[PDB]
Amino acid sequence: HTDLSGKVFVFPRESVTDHVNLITPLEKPLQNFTLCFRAYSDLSRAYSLFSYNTQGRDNELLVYKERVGEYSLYIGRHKVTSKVIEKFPAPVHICVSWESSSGIAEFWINGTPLVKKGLRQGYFVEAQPKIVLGQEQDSYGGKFDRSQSFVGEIGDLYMWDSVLPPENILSAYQGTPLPANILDWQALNYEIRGYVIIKPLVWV
Amino acid sequence: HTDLSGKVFVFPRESVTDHVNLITPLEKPLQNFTLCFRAYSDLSRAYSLFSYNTQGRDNELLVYKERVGEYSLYIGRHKVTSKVIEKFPAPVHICVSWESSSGIAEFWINGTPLVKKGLRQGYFVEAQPKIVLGQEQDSYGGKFDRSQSFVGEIGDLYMWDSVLPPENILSAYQGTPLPANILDWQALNYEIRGYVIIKPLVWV
Amino acid sequence: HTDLSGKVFVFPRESVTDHVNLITPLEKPLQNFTLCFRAYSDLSRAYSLFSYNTQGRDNELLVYKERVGEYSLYIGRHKVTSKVIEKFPAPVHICVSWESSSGIAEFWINGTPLVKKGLRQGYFVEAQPKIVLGQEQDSYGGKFDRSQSFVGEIGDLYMWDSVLPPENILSAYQGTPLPANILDWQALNYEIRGYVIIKPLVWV
Amino acid sequence: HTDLSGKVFVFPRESVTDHVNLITPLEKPLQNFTLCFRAYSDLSRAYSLFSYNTQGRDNELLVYKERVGEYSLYIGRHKVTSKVIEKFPAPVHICVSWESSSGIAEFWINGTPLVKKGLRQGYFVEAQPKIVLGQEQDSYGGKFDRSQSFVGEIGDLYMWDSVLPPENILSAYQGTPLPANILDWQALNYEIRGYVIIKPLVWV
Amino acid sequence: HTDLSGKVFVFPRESVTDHVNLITPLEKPLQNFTLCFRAYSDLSRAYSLFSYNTQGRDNELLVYKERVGEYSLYIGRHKVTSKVIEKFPAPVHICVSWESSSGIAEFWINGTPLVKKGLRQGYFVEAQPKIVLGQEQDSYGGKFDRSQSFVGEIGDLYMWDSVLPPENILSAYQGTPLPANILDWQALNYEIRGYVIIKPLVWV
Amino acid sequence: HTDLSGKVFVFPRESVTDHVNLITPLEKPLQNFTLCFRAYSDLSRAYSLFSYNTQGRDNELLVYKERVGEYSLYIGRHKVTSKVIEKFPAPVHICVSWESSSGIAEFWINGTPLVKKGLRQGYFVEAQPKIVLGQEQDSYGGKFDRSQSFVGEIGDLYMWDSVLPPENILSAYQGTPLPANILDWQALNYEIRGYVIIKPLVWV
Amino acid sequence: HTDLSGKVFVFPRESVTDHVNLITPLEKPLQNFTLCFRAYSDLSRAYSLFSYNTQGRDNELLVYKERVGEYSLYIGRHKVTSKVIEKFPAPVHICVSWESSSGIAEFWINGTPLVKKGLRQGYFVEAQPKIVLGQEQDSYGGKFDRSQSFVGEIGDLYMWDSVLPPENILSAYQGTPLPANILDWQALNYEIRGYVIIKPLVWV
Amino acid sequence: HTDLSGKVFVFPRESVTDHVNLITPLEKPLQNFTLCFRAYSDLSRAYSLFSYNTQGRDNELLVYKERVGEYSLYIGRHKVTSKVIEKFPAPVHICVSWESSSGIAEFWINGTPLVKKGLRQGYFVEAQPKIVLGQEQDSYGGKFDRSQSFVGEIGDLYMWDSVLPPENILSAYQGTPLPANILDWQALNYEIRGYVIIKPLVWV
Amino acid sequence: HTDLSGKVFVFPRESVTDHVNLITPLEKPLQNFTLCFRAYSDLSRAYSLFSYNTQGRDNELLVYKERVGEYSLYIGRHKVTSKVIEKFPAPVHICVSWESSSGIAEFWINGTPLVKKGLRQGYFVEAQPKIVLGQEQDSYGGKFDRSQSFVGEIGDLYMWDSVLPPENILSAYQGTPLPANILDWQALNYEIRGYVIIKPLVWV
Amino acid sequence: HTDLSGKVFVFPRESVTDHVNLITPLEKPLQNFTLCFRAYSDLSRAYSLFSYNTQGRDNELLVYKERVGEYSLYIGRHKVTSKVIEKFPAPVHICVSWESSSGIAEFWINGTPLVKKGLRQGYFVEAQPKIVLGQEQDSYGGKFDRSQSFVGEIGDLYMWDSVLPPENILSAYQGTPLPANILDWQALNYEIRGYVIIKPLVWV
């Protein structure tokens, strides 16, 4: 595992090929979770930000940006969509949390709460995943789509197994995130495939 | 009755199912009233904020959002609509007051006064009502419409049987409202139906 | 005569009947004059602010709003128009002065001066008029048009027999106006017709 | 010679006759120069600000507005056009300089330099001119266009026989200009023909 | 080697002939670089800022502007494009970096980093260049296009044979740049051909 | 008394001065009427076809066209408006009837009937009138607006004192109308002022 | 008992008062029905062609036009709509057929079948109604809307107690309709309230 | 089997219920096929004409209309799309063929050939299907989507297990198609489920 | 003089150089005159068809196509315009007449008369000209504008010194040209300078 | 050589792969030529119709469609574009002929001639080419652009080494082509690479 503090993945071109595979020791199905990251991209079209897929289950947990100012979370095939006023193009902090008990999805865009939505209440998101940046999975770790590929910069990725409160969300955005127990940027297990470069984060 | 301080009703999906029934000790005809609440919704279409139907009469008192910037009030089937500059999506604090003797409707958005309109001078909204949040009523307690459903977050709801002065309306917006006698958030008799969850209010 | 300080004429509904008659101690033809008042309405179509009609003479003096950000002045059937940047909807302070010798119509919105216009050099505006508020006059005190009817909140109406210099115009905008000779808000002779209520001024 | 300190020219109507002639005692071929003035108009269509014509040749020196945000200078029939972001309507202050040795047109809207242009290198603007204000010359002091006329206010017009360096440019805008030699607003020789009045400058 | 500190190349008209040739001491193939300059123009259409061609190789290194808010870097015929929010017209500061080893192309606009792109990894830009301003090359030093011509103001041009850290980019932006070895505006060898003037930089 | 068969009244330039005064010796208060004419005009803006004004009264009878395919009638200040599908530009034949008692307006464009409209029941249009071809009146023979001026060709103007039946209107459309008792084209007492020329009909 | 062959109801103006009350000897609940009529109107906005209401039941039977090319039919508060290519404005022949057993509504425009719709299977429309023309009913005989008023020409109105087959539809459109037994234009019981006239049918 | 000559299936309303199950003697997997039917619908949105699904294979064979003048055939999940000029709404005759050896899809709209497209060369469409009309399956016989439902009329359905040449396709269009051996309208087996009525074909 | 019957001058490319000089044996100043020619050009932007310039006189007589379906005739600098229905792009025949005593210019596009227009009533154009085809003149025989170059095909160019009657205009269109007195296509003296080719007329 | 009489190449999908190579024994530079074919496609975007590349030479003889109603020819990198009224989508016969002596590019669409254009006067198009259908060469035989690929049907391709007179172009379109010396459809040497099927021509 690597300390990626002050660095970002750069997905420098539109492709069916460039991705980073995120390795996790998660053997337990997910009930609660929070996911945080920082994105910079000037893509007009729809792209995937974070693709989490299990065997036989496509789109198990997916953060997808369908268009400017519109953020989508997919749990177990089902989706929710929340809107927001945002400048284009701009760097963005994104935190999404979901909760099996309440079904509640919680988007935070730059430490600002989006409208809460709800999906898949009681659903247990399956374990032993394949997580990928830069590409949207249609298979277990494969079947990428070019017109869905991410091009731009991603960093400060943290993933917890619990619903973070507003303070802790604001902590991540302000630059001091609680040590995360599923995916931790400062101790990250990644695999680069194709054209992706690690560079200093300068748009912060 | 329950203390709902620092909590909201969240209507996480669009449906014809989800609503919240509000129960009020009111056995009295409404000469004067003021109704206040905090809403937060990213709907482009039209929706209902507060549905007040009585015994055979539809839309006896109704607060309806026709589009962005356009807040309507219905008294006994009759309509008044006042416009305002607002950002979308964005949280809003609505107050609406009505007087019988003058017919004057008074809309207040985020502590700012809207253009006065008038309707049903020398009339009274009927007693023993069925009050629902999250859907619009075409019957006494039912007949909901999907394209009228509220999906988002409502909180800090109060209803007085008086026309609250500007200072008092401002005090509700500032987060310290005066105890109410019809509907009170700090003592609300409610009934959840379908999919509505109580989460802490995070957008203030 | 009655003191209307901190109170406004609200025209709460679109109508063809509801208006307010103003009878002034005017017995001499007008050479120089200034009309100043406050208005708050979310009406989007054309409407009349101040109608001044005499026997056999149409629109001898008319303060008219064609659209948003465009204020017209009719003097003896002649027409002048000036544009300005303004928010909609938003309360406005309208001031209009006209000189006979130079023909110069002066327009002031929110204390800011608009482009000087000119009309009817060496012309006397008629005496013994019938002044209505909330409606437009096609005949001597009657013949209203429903699509020209003002619906909103008018207030602080003042009229002088002299062309007001800039310092005095600003004085009117702050809320400390100079003693008016023709029409005064603190001493007004008015006739109420149809639906028109007098409520306190809140939008200032 | 007339002192016009704190005064403006108003052309109060769309006309074909209203113009202000300006006499200048200079009878030398023009090498370098600078022209500053102020203007307050609400015209959507094109209009001529300043017109400088000699015997037998059209547009020896014409400052022309094409539309909102576009300003043009003519040097002997030849044209240059520079753009800027501006409010409409809004009072404007235009300084322009043309150097014969370099052809450099230097536009300054409200003390901000617009992109420098170039035209007619090694050319002399002709002596014995007829300068008009409020109209556009097509013959020597005649042949006017109704669709090019100026309606609005004009003041603080000063003309030097040198290219005024950016420091002195600002001095003019701030209200305290260098004493001019070609045309002085403090000591002007002008001629009113038609409907155009003298009024004090109220819009600064 | 002339100190052009506080002066700008002004391309005053649209032409297919007017350009400036920059001579560089560079006979080691380019591997890494930074390019910084200021640009003031009101052109709506597409235009080249900087053209670097070698024998038999078109668009070896080209900084090109498709439209407002869109900047393109060309390396070895290949292209990347990044987007920005920018006012028009407005004085702009540009730095672009490139680094064969990673292929990352790094655009900075007025001190703001755009989205990093990537082109030609393992490629080195040919030496023995002919560098032009004000025109776009389609051959070795010639073949100009009138629709591609740059009209406006260019100053404070610098070029380094290294990728500049974020710091040094801002050092350049705020008018105290680092010593450059390829192209130095304080010691630039240049040839003016056709119509292009040197005048003081007054929009900073 | 002048035979105008195969002749038109070309209004060749847009103006404020050029008008043709149509005089009739009918001193009877008009009960029923019909009016025919051909016209040719490539004006996209609004204009007046036929103006009728009396003592102290505006637009007692008026045939006005707001926009392509829209024709409107005015009787004693009141309006009616009917639409039709036409080409542009298009040589047009227009006839209109008004039966006082039924108050019915009968537009007959190009031999095809329009949707009937109703105005001023129990009304008789006045006598001793001033009728103008080529301008729009807002006074007794005066007050003309350039933006209401007609420019183009007008021909075959006939006018009867009774409401013409369908069969009779068709006859007029062919080019063989019945003898008119008020306004005969084969016997028209007219008056030319300014630029308006006679030329043979070539379009029909 | 009135033979209105070759005659129409002309509703000549927009109003809240003008209508025709249709009286029918139908005192049995309606299982099947066919309604045909001709209408000429250049109205752009939504209006009501045929209004049929019963005791305490709104919109029992209603032919309503939402816009150009869109035709609606209401059977007991329930709605169905069907679209058609049509010239605007133009005269139209409408046929609507309803059949309770299947629910199938059948719209025939100018003798052309629209797409078949369905509503209220096994339902009987109420007996003993009030039928109005020219206005829309919100109550039993009254409660009209100006923004729903019909203006134009209606004729050849027939209503049968059975579902009419094509040949008979084409017969009605052709001009020789089969004898009707609810409403018969050739022997109609009509009542004019307000401004509606009877004029010849000319537009066929 | 049922003879459906001169009759249509009418889908009277937007639903997630109303479907016709079609049943067929196909137990050999499809290699070649032609499909023809007549549809009449005013539905603006996307809908399925013909849905054919096998165990665990969705959209095995599907004719789907995305928008106006756009027809799509899906074979084995893959799709092809061809465009056509067509009036809306209007009755349409669709033919579509597919040939496995070439992979060519052939569309015919009103006897006119569209652009040939190719997909799934060498593929066999699976036997033992579920064919539904009115709805679009996502499961084997079920899981319908409301916004994909067909409302309108379908008739003259025929399916062969061969690729028909133009003559036969143009014969099918004209009215006399040759005995079809997969689905044959003149000997059809069907299950009506929900709201769908059999009514005579009136629009051909 | 050479025979050009069934032959055309083609202007194959946009240029600032390609033109056709037309020399005429005309020392007589034009009083009444008519000019006819055929054009085939797919140019969207404005262009000149027929430039006629005299010593020290710009645009003495000039046919200038402003845009599609818009033909302008310049006479002695002054401007008239007429619009017409036409297909783009399409071969066109344009006849233009003008009468000195009338100022009436008549346009005949393809044989249809356009709206008569008037200018310079009482003017005679100068003799000793320089007629150019393909270019717009700014001086006596030169100073071309590239944005006005005519690129396309011109055939059957004729010019008479008399106002041709409608029947002779229609003869000219059909290819039966009356013997020309000024400019004859069957016997034209011409000078070709630049890139312009002679081809047979194939688009009639 | 193969007799492709009555057959087409169907390029059934968008690819960067599928193309037909055309093989001719051409060994001498082409002074003149005529190329004709039938094309059917619903492609909205730009595409190549016929790419002809020699060694080291790109776009030597290219027919390329930029958009609807706009046909282009490239000779030695240089281009011409001629526009045409056409329906989309629609089958089309294209004939292009270029003449070196004159430079004349002549385009024929469905027998109708477009505006003649001109390029590369005196040029000779190189021998030993590489002729492809379905794609667009950037190199000698390859370097395809998907965003430029042809997808549709293509047939009746014939190429002569002469410039055809109108009667032979017409005869080609009518279906009886003059025998061709370079490329003959009735004896074609082709190379299919990828996915292109031969189907019988049905759209004529």
Ligand SMILES: [Ca+2]
């Ligand atoms: Ca009036």
Ligand SMILES: [Ca+2]
């Ligand atoms: Ca001029």
Ligand SMILES: [Ca+2]
């Ligand atoms: Ca280049």
Ligand SMILES: [Ca+2]
């Ligand atoms: Ca007028």
Ligand SMILES: [Ca+2]
């Ligand atoms: Ca109703």
Ligand SMILES: [Ca+2]
């Ligand atoms: Ca010229």
Ligand SMILES: [Ca+2]
């Ligand atoms: Ca010119």
Ligand SMILES: [Ca+2]
């Ligand atoms: Ca190429």
